[PDB]
Every structure is written in structure tokens, then in C-alpha cells.
């Protein structure tokens, strides 16, 4: 899970270069959110036919239900790892890998409304596009793959995030040490 704030339409009149960047970035972010909303809506012949992501999709289908997010959302409000039992009975671990909401809603937008959209310090706009950058790549990868990515990139799951996920997987230390030393192959599978 990535925590997002939905940004409503900004009322910024003016063509000062500082405003032009802030508005440019806010619209760039709003497009990604809109883009991601569009997405919710010799002897080989002997082998036989699997459904590679049937398991992952089955979990993904449950998340569409009314207020399944609130189960997730409340579980991770105080920590970044929790096990949630979904409506179908499946308990699945959930992880909060990024909190972009608190920066936007409680640091950026307050400064925008305070300074009438004329940002004084250019460093806050560069801060913003860097904060904003990962979510933009995540949405690009999904936009070009119809929502299903393989291998799992470092924007989808950073190297430390994956190594931490392995520790919490229901596997032997032989399995954890195997996966931990071959993350690049793990990503490919």
C-alpha cells in the first residue's frame, strides 16, 4: 500500500515561473491518480496450461469490495506491517511502503494556501517532484503493461523492502537465505 492524498483542482492564477512549476507538478500528480483509476476499471506441447497470476488476482479481486480498504487502512495506521483477514477469509500480510499523503496535505498544500500559490523557496518544488517521482514511475510501469508487471522493478518494491518482505514470509531459513542472495532472480520470477 502507498498512502495518497487526492488533490482537488487548484485555483492558481499567475504565470510566475515558480507558480508554473508547482501547478505543473500538481497536474502531473493528478494525471497519475486519474491514470491509475482507469486501471481499476522439443517437447513443450506436452506441458499443460497454468494461470500464472490466478493467485495474485484472486487476492486483488477481494480488494474491490466495499470498504475492504478501510480494513487495510486502519490496520496500518500505527505500524507499516499488519495481517488483515479479508472478506473471503484469507489473511494476507499488508505493508505500507510509502506515505505521500502527509507531505502533500500537511506540508505542501498548507504553504500553497498561505502564500497565495506564489512559492518563495524553489527548494520545496524540487522536494515535491522528488517525493512525487516514485509514484509517477509506478504508474508508468502499470500504464504500459495493463496493470501486471514482471519482473518486479525497484520502483514497485525497493531492494530493502523486498529483503524485509522475505524475513516475514512463512519459509525456512534455507529459503530466506536462498531468496536473499538472489533478489535479482526473485524479481524475475
Amino acid at each position, epitope marked *: 500500500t502507498i498512502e495518497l492524498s*487526492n*488533490i*482537488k*483542482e*487548484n*485555483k*492558481c492564477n499567475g504565470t510566475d515561473a515558480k507558480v508554473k512549476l508547482i501547478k505543473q507538478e*500538481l497536474d502531473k500528480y493528478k494525471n497519475a491518480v486519474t491514470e491509475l483509476q482507469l486501471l481499476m476499471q522439443f517437447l513443450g506441447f506436452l506441458l499443460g496450461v497454468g494461470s500464472a497470476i490466478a493467485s495474485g488476482v484472486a487476492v486483488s479481486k477481494v480488494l474491490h469490495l466495499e470498504g475492504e480498504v478501510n480494513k487495510i487502512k486502519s490496520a496500518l495506521l500505527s505500524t507499516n506491517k499488519a495481517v488483515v483477514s479479508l472478506s473471503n477469509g484469507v489473511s494476507v500480510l499488508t505493508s505500507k511502503v510509502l506515505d505521500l499523503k*502527509n507531505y502533500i*496535505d*500537511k*506540508q505542501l*498544500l*498548507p*504553504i*500553497v*494556501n*498561505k502564500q*497565495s*500559490c506564489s512559492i518563495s523557496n524553489i527548494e520545496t518544488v524540487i522536494e515535491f517532484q522528488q517525493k512525487n517521482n516514485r509514484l509517477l514511475e509506478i504508474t508508468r510501469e502499470f500504464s504500459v503493461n495493463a496493470g501486471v508487471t514482471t519482473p518486479v522493478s525497484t520502483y514497485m518494491l525497493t531492494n530493502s523492502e523486498l529483503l524485509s518482505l522475505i524475513n516475514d514470509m512463512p519459509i525456512t531459513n534455507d529459503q530466506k537465505k536462498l531468496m536473499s542472495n538472489n533478489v535479482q532472480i526473485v524479481r524475475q520470477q
Partner: antibody, heavy 123, light 112 residues
Framework: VQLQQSGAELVKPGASVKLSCTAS????????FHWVKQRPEQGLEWIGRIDPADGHTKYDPKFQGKATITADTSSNTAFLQLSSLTSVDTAVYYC?????????????????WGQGTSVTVSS | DIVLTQSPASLAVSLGQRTTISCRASESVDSFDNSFIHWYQQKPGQPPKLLIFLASSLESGVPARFSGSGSRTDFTLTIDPVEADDAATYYC?????????FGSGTKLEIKR
């Protein structure tokens, strides 16, 4: 712009009531709405807020079950349903939003207020 | 919940003098650089009118006779000079944490 709330209400104890707040001059999809309770000679109590664009709501838990906030973008109207009323629900109920602000936040101040709906609970 | 204590509960002020109202928070109401405190004026029969947003920002259309100050748990609304129209009740409000909470109010009376 204008937020026009529905008229005064007389409610039997135990019954329910649904209050309305119709917006003119702007589209409610583009901001957030709050409901605020003010009992006579009492303070202000924030009931909750809604994002009309997707139905997302957040309540003070004190009002959970008691207060239900909904919105309808089709008629540009926000609603507050109060359920199973008792005498402590007799109060003025306000609608509110941020409009006088560059970017609307759910955490922004409440700069526009409806005129209030006066709910009286009595047999 | 964050509890906001406003004092005095009521005060009398002469025309043209400056006066201050206090609002003290239970916990800090700051995120990053900003204080999420707001001040509203309410006259009988009307909804509140926003005067100051965040800590010190004057709402558009509000006379520059109103000012706000404060940083973490201690906040001040100042009216200077006081005018006859300023007789009303003033409320502070925080939005840094859910649920949003209001102060218990300070009633300003004009002395004549």
C-alpha cells in the same frame, strides 16, 4: 456562491431525520464538506467530513451510528442523516466547506458555512 | 481528542484599544512548518465566519484589524483597534488531528 440548507425540523424521539445542504455557485465534486453541531449555549462539535467525489467519509467516533454523511454530485447536495434521535440531539446543524482557498484540503479551514438547520426533538 | 482551552471566557474591551484572546492546545497542533489552528467569529443568529486560518493567515475579506500568532500549543488572536461591530463570540479550531475540535469560546463585549 451559496450553501442553502434545509428548513427547521421537528422530530419524534427515536425517529430519524435527513438534512440537506444544496450548493450554488460551484460544483461540490471539487471540495470537501463538513457538518458541525452547535447545541444551544453549548460548543461546536465536528461531526465528520465527506469528499463528494468518491463518498469517502470520516466521523468523530462519538457520532458513529448516530450520524451518516452522504453526498450526491448529481444534485450538488450534501446530506446528514441523524438516526434514533433523543433530546441530546436537539441542536443546530451546520454545513461547511473550503472555497476561499487556492487548493481545497480536508484539513483546511471552514471558510463558508450554510445557515444552519435547527433540529428539535419532542413529542 | 485534542482539547482546546480558550481564555478568558468573556471580557470587556473599550473601542480602539487592542485586546488578545488565548487558545491553548492539549497536544501540539503542528505538522512540519504549519500550525493547524483557526479562528472564527460568530454573531448571534449567524454561522461562524472565518477570520484567521492556519496560525497567522488572514482570511480574504477580513479586516486587517485581526491578527493571529502562536506556534505549538499556545495561540493568540488579536483585535486592534477594537470596533463596535466586533462584539461577538470567538472560537478557535484545530484540524491537525482527527477529530477536529473547537475551543469552548470567548465572548467579547464592547464597553461603552
Amino acid at each position: 456562491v451559496q450553501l442553502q440548507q434545509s428548513g427547521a425540523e421537528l422530530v419524534k424521539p427515536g425517529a430519524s431525520v435527513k438534512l440537506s445542504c444544496t450548493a450554488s455557485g460551484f460544483n461540490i465534486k471539487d471540495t470537501f464538506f463538513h457538518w458541525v453541531k452547535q447545541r444551544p449555549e453549548q460548543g461546536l462539535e465536528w461531526i465528520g467530513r465527506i469528499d463528494p467525489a468518491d463518498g469517502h467519509t470520516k466521523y468523530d467516533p462519538k457520532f458513529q451510528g448516530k450520524a451518516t454523511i452522504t453526498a450526491d454530485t448529481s444534485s450538488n447536495t450534501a446530506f446528514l442523516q441523524l438516526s434514533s434521535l433523543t433530546s441530546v440531539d436537539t441542536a443546530v446543524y451546520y454545513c461547511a466547506t473550503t472555497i476561499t482557498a487556492v487548493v481545497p484540503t480536508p484539513y483546511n479551514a471552514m471558510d463558508y458555512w450554510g445557515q444552519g438547520t435547527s433540529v428539535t426533538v419532542s413529542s | 481528542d485534542i482539547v482546546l482551552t480558550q481564555s478568558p471566557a468573556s471580557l470587556a474591551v473599550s473601542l480602539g484599544q487592542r485586546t488578545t484572546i488565548s487558545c491553548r492546545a492539549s497536544e501540539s497542533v503542528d505538522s512540519f512548518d504549519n500550525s493547524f489552528i483557526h479562528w472564527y467569529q460568530q454573531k448571534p443568529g449567524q454561522p461562524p465566519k472565518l477570520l484567521i486560518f492556519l496560525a497567522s493567515s488572514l482570511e480574504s475579506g477580513v479586516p486587517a484589524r485581526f491578527s493571529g500568532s502562536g506556534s505549538r500549543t499556545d495561540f493568540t488572536l488579536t483585535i486592534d483597534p477594537v470596533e463596535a461591530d466586533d462584539a461577538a463570540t470567538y472560537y478557535c479550531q484545530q484540524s491537525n488531528e482527527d477529530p477536529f475540535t473547537f475551543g469552548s469560546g470567548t465572548k467579547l463585549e464592547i464597553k461603552r
